[PDB]
Design a protein around this ligand. Structure first.
Ligand SMILES: Nc1nc2c(c(=O)[nH]1)N[C@H]1C(S)=C(S)[C@@H](COP(=O)(O)OP(=O)(O)OC[C@H]3O[C@@H](n4cnc5c(=O)[nH]c(N)nc54)[C@H](O)[C@@H]3O)O[C@H]1N2
Ligand SMILES: Nc1nc2c(c(=O)[nH]1)N[C@H]1C(S)=C(S)[C@@H](COP(=O)(O)OP(=O)(O)OC[C@H]3O[C@@H](n4cnc5c(=O)[nH]c(N)nc54)[C@H](O)[C@@H]3O)O[C@H]1N2
Ligand code: SF4
Ligand code: SF4
Ligand code: SF4
Ligand code: SF4
Ligand code: SF4
Ligand SMILES: [Mo]
Lengths: 814, 234
């Protein structure tokens, strides 16, 4: 045990290789430290302009994912022909050639039978090389059913930004320069979309920003905020609307952005209409109409009656935001907006970003910077045969675009995925049966509300193959397992991130020798499948790949799987390293430089870039969303009904003008409150790498970094008032029951829980995945699966699944 | 020389990244965390305060763990660090009783024993801890850091104690402690408290320093500055 002599010491001499973490959609650029062929450490890539070396804590858990002792090392096929939660698949190992042979035979059979639309491709997580496997392969086979997970993620959170300022997408938040931060359910030092960067800056920002966090639980962010507002689930818009009301009454909207009364005097008097012609809007549209149709009556007293919030607090917040303008940013989380009527919470909260001028302003929020990253491979129309051209026109299996599923992504009826509803279409064979399914990087039985519907749906699919690292809950229903090389350590990919006023593009590259007989999901597997399909007489995918996906420098197709994996990334990133990207940001001299640095950074965001040129119907920031009216009109006309009839069919309260303005929708609730007296407050663990760290022992060892939670346990947190009411004590084994299901976990009493609610992390309750994540693999879960409690419901205007607000539960000791 | 650490609680977000980095750096057994924390929730709804205080060895000026160690295994080095010659540790646990801070762990369990399991959740399909060990060439766990062995056992023997070494092996190379590098907000800073110009020395003059249990008389050299939370407005 003597200290080693200097020539033999090993500290600091290993190799750092760039990659990208995907524990969340922060998608941080990383470096992996490698010694003796093993990945030993993860750090933020210092070259990153978004986050630098800053990282959230989950980067370290990555090491227990690549070195997860329950990873698949071989393709497999089930030998039990029956599928179900109660059916052991009896997987046996097979070769890649045999596994793809089986899948290829099933695909080709569809085409021979002129039913290629009964193929479905399901995508969970992904990288920006996904276009081939997700879209091109699917359409060339002849199916419209490339089903992403977007609507179980955050599509409702895009409704406000899109229908108010033309951004079907996320924003970055200029915390370093903020003077007021208002968060409706966002917890950016634990989750949301740059945990590394917002953790870097949050504490420092408290010296110049006043921070209010509106969340039914005391989140980490609320614990480091000037005010925690413990909102009743589903009532966020009430506060957002009352703030806007007070801002008008007090005259403290941001005049350089919004405009002003022509004659100077503030004519907004509570309860009383104003002449539209008396106000001259600058970069906004609809302020006075919004006031006249609804906002004039959304007083602090009205809001206090609903929420219990002190009206003096509402007023003080509104005035503080007015004085901070335009250095004002309003965050919305999934919690606020992924509710059956949540489109209008996104709209109501985001309207404040326009009203106080924070949109595209210093201290405010704005979209990701432009980058030249390509996101699609070449068009495949020339490779579409008649079978495929007919199949891709079929209605999608998720029923998007029906009267009650407008799913108005980017203003289009049926424009958005309805991930959770694909299970319903499958299990009802409506519009038709799905006979062949390929799915990757997804676990919808666990991650979708009421995922037992996926149990049912998948048990009815003739043939399904799952591309996965682990045998997860979804995998249990597969005919074939196709083991994936781990995205962060064994894969070529490319991702992006936004924050700190920049957008970055980062590489994923293998940092270790491939552990097992796996293949990269988005490149090698579709390449190998295309070859197999060509061998069997359907060579359109193979020809498409070999003729269209060729090296950007040499023009040659890939010689083999491994070359193709890298080629997929080289092709899309060539604008960054082959061409001069100086106009957008960094100038890279070569592919090798891109790989060595691992990240490309844009120039800093040009403030006010979008002022006066939003991609809305009016080109204004729309308090009265003519953009949304046009989308609703298109949907209504498609179904030969009025817009009001669409609202009714989609179970919104809005009628007439209210469909197009920020307004109060009473939150949808499911179940009898007297039988189910508690509202579920679903949350993420700050150690969740989405649904993928429950098989990591370090996750459990540090689980109490989630405020109120308990190491090595799955707890539901109750206010002590409700603990006393229901006879619960810390550590009690409890059953939580909703109208649609139940789970068991343990009780924790915590004052950071709003009375009448129960705050519980999603992420445990696996019955598969691995030996640490489950009690008895395939049979008995560890902890409790939140989504078994959550009734299958939708924000029908966006297609989003609802995970919040509507879930009533009861609790008892087991 | 008196190396120590200043932790800025305003910058700290209570994420545990420092503690997880310590796991990867130092190959601590499952359940052993040299870096850990003390979290507290105070108040009744709605006036609730949550605080997280990162903890580690305080590398004390007057370390009782050193004074009681019967073998001299626990000792002070010339940087002021409390280090351990693990080879001389007889597992008497006297250091643990003497340390007021509960930062010492005893290896009653065979380290990394869970990696000896060769069972497979899907036979001949998924792998096993033992198989992953063989595949990667690791001795005890595929996550083991060989750098640790520069100055301390990479894998400690059963029946010895262990604790934060202030990443002495990294300091020897002129590098930072893993937990310092791992902190997203740069909340953790180390340096020589005997150098009045060091960042740590200046930080505790600029801000009121706080120590854990200074009443125990050990002269801890982890100093906490500022506040995790802020006073509620409105
Ligand atoms: N640690 C971690 N971070 C992540 C991820 C992860 O898996 N783990 N996933 C990433 C991804 S894919 C996503 S889409 C984003 C999502 O990031 P966000 O949209 O910011 O929200 P969530 O992380 O889903 O957290 C939901 C929060 O809403 C709260 N809330 C619940 N119900 C209500 C309500 O009615 N009103 C209000 N105001 N709040 C409510 C919960 O307490 C919780 O704090 O996070 C990304 N960041
Ligand atoms: N109650 C509740 N439900 C939620 C959330 C919540 O906060 N609360 N968050 C929701 C959100 S925002 C999202 S975006 C969705 C995400 O939901 P999903 O897209 O279903 O993602 P995961 O649950 O992480 O499942 C990913 C699966 O990929 C496999 N896999 C794991 N690692 C790899 C790899 O490296 N390569 C490949 N090919 N496969 C791998 C495993 O089967 C893993 O279960 O979950 C959502 N569901
Ligand atoms: S888990 Fe998310 S925030 Fe944390 S390092 Fe990975 S990508 Fe970044
Ligand atoms: S890594 Fe930094 S911010 Fe996170 S808990 Fe440790 S000291 Fe605090
Ligand atoms: S904190 Fe405890 S173990 Fe560390 S030097 Fe002080 S007394 Fe010894
Ligand atoms: S357990 Fe080891 S280090 Fe601690 S006092 Fe005993 S011999 Fe010394
Ligand atoms: S200084 Fe090193 S040994 Fe001590 S807590 Fe930090 S990472 Fe662990
Ligand atoms: Mo998501």
């Amino acid at each position: 045990g003597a200290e080693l002599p200097a020539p033999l010491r090993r500290t600091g001499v290993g190799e750092w290789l760039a990659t990208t973490c995907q524990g969340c959609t922060s998608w941080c650029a990383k470096q992996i430290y490698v010694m003796d062929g093993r990945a030993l450490k993860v750090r933020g890539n210092p070259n990153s302009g978004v986050h630098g070396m800053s990282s959230c804590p989950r980067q370290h858990l990555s090491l227990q994912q690549v070195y997860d002792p329950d990873r698949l090392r071989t393709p497999m096929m089930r030998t039990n022909p029956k599928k179900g939660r109660d059916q052991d698949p009896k997987f046996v190992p097979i070769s890649w050639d045999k596994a793809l042979d089986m899948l290829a035979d099933k695909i080709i059979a569809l085409r021979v039978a002129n039913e290629p639309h009964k193929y479905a491709l399901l995508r969970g997580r992904y990288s920006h090389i996904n276009d081939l496997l997700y879209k091109k392969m699917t359409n060339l086979i002849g199916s419209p059913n490339n089903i992403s997970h977007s609507s179980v993620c955050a599509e409702a959170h895009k409704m406000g930004p899109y229908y108010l300022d033309g951004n079907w997408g996320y924003n970055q938040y200029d915390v370093k320069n903020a003077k007021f931060i208002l968060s409706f359910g966002a917890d950016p030092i634990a989750s949301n979309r740059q945990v590394s960067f917002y953790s870097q800056t949050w504490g420092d920002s408290l010296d110049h920003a006043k921070v209010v966090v509106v969340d039914p639980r005391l989140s980490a962010s609320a614990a480091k905020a000037h005010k925690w507002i413990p909102i009743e689930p589903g009532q966020d818009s009430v506060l957002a609307l009352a703030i806007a009301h007070v801002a008008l009454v007090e005259g403290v909207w941001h005049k350089p952005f919004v405009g002003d009364f022509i004659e100077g005097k503030n004519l907004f008097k509570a309860g009383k209409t104003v002449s539209v012609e008396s106000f001259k809007e600058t970069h906004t549209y609809g302020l006075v109409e919004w006031w006249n149709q609804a906002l004039k009556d959304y007083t602090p007293e009205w809001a206090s009656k609903i929420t219990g919030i002190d009206p003096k607090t509402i007023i003080a917040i509104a005035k503080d935001m007015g004085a901070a303008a335009p250095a004002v940013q309003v965050w919305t989380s999934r919690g606020a907006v992924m509710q059956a009527r949540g489109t209008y919470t996104s709209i109501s909260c985001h309207a404040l970003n326009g009203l106080f001028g924070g949109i595209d302003s210093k201290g405010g929020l704005f979209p990701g910077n432009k980058t030249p990253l390509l996101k699609e491979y070449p068009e495949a129309k020339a490779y579409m045969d008649e079978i495929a051209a007919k199949g891709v026109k079929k209605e999608k299996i998720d029923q998007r675009g029906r009267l009650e599923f407008p799913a108005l992504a980017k203003g289009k009826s049926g424009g958005g995925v309805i991930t959770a509803n694909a299970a319903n279409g499958i299990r009802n064979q409506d519009p038709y049966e799905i006979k062949v399914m390929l799915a990757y990087f997804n676990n919808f039985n666990f991650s979708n509300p009421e995922g037992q519907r996926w149990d049912e749906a998948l048990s009815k699919v003739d043939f399904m193959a799952h591309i996965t690292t682990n045998v997860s809950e979804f995998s249990w229903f597969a005919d074939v397992l196709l083991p994936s090389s781990h995205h962060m350590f064994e894969k070529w990919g490319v991702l992006d991130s936004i924050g700190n006023g920049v957008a970055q593009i980062s590489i994923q590259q293998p940092s270790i020798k491939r552990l097992w007989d796996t293949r990269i999901d988005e490149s090698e597997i579709p390449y190998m499948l295309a070859k197999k399909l060509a061998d069997k007489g359907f060579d359109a995918p193979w020809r498409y790949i070999n003729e269209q996906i060729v090296d950007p420098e040499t023009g040659k197709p890939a010689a083999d799987e491994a070359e193709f994996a890298k080629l997929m990334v080289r092709y899309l990133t060539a604008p960054l390293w082959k061409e001069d990207a100086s106009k957008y940001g960094d100038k890279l001299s070569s592919w090798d430089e891109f790989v060595q640095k691992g990240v490309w950074n844009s120039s800093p965001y040009k403030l006010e870039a979008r002022w006066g040129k939003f991609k809305t119907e009016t080109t204004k920031f729309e308090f009265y969303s003519k953009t949304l009216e046009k989308a609703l009109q298109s949907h209504a006309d498609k179904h030969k009904v009025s817009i009001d009839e669409v609202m009714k069919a989609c179970d919104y309260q809005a009628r007439g003008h209210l469909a197009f303005i920020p307004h109060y929708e009473e939150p949808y609730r499911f179940g009898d409150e007297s039988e189910f007296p508690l509202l579920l407050v679903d949350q993420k663990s700050r150690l969740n790498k989405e649904g993928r760290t429950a098989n990591s022992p370090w996750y459990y060892e540090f689980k109490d970094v989630d405020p109120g939670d308990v190491a090595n346990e799955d707890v539901a947190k109750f206010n002590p008032i409700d603990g006393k009411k229901f006879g619960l004590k810390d550590g009690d084994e409890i059953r939580i029951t909703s109208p649609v299901g139940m789970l068991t976990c343990k009780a924790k009493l915590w004052e950071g829980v709003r009375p009448g609610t129960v705050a519980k992390c999603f992420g445990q309750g696996h019955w598969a995945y691995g030996r640490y994540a489950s009690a008895k693999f395939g049979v008995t879960p560890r902890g409790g699966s939140n989504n078994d409690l959550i009734a299958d419901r939708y924000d029908r205007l966006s297609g989003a699944s609802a995970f919040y607000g509507h879930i009533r539960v009861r609790v008892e000791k087991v | 020389m008196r190396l120590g650490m200043v932790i800025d609680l305003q910058k700290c977000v209570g994420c545990g990244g420092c503690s997880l980095a310590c796991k990867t750096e130092n190959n601590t057994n499952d359940g052993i965390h040299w870096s850990h924390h003390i979290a507290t929730t105070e108040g009744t709804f709605p006036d609730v305060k949550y605080t997280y205080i990162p903890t580690l060895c305080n590398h004390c000026d007057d370390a009782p763990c050193v004074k009681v160690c019967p073998t001299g295994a626990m000792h002070k080095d010339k940087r002021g660090l409390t280090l351990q010659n693990n080879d001389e540790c007889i597992g008497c646990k006297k250091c643990m009783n003497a340390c007021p801070y509960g930062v010492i762990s005893f290896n009653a369990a065979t380290p990394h024993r869970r990696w000896q399991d060769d069972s497979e959740v899907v036979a001949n399909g998924t792998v096993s801890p033992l198989m992953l060990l063989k595949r990667t060439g690791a001795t005890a766990t595929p996550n083991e850091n060989p750098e640790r062995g520069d100055t301390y056992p990479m894998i400690r023997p059963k029946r010895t104690t262990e604790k934060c070494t202030f990443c002495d092996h990294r300091l020897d190379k002129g590098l930072n402690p893993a937990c310092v590098d791992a902190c997203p907000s740069e909340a953790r800073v180390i340096g020589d408290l005997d150098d009045p110009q060091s960042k740590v020395s200046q930080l505790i003059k600029l801000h009121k320093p706080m120590q854990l249990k200074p009443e125990a008389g050990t002269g801890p050299r982890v100093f906490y500055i500022r506040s995790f939370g802020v006073k509620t407005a409105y």
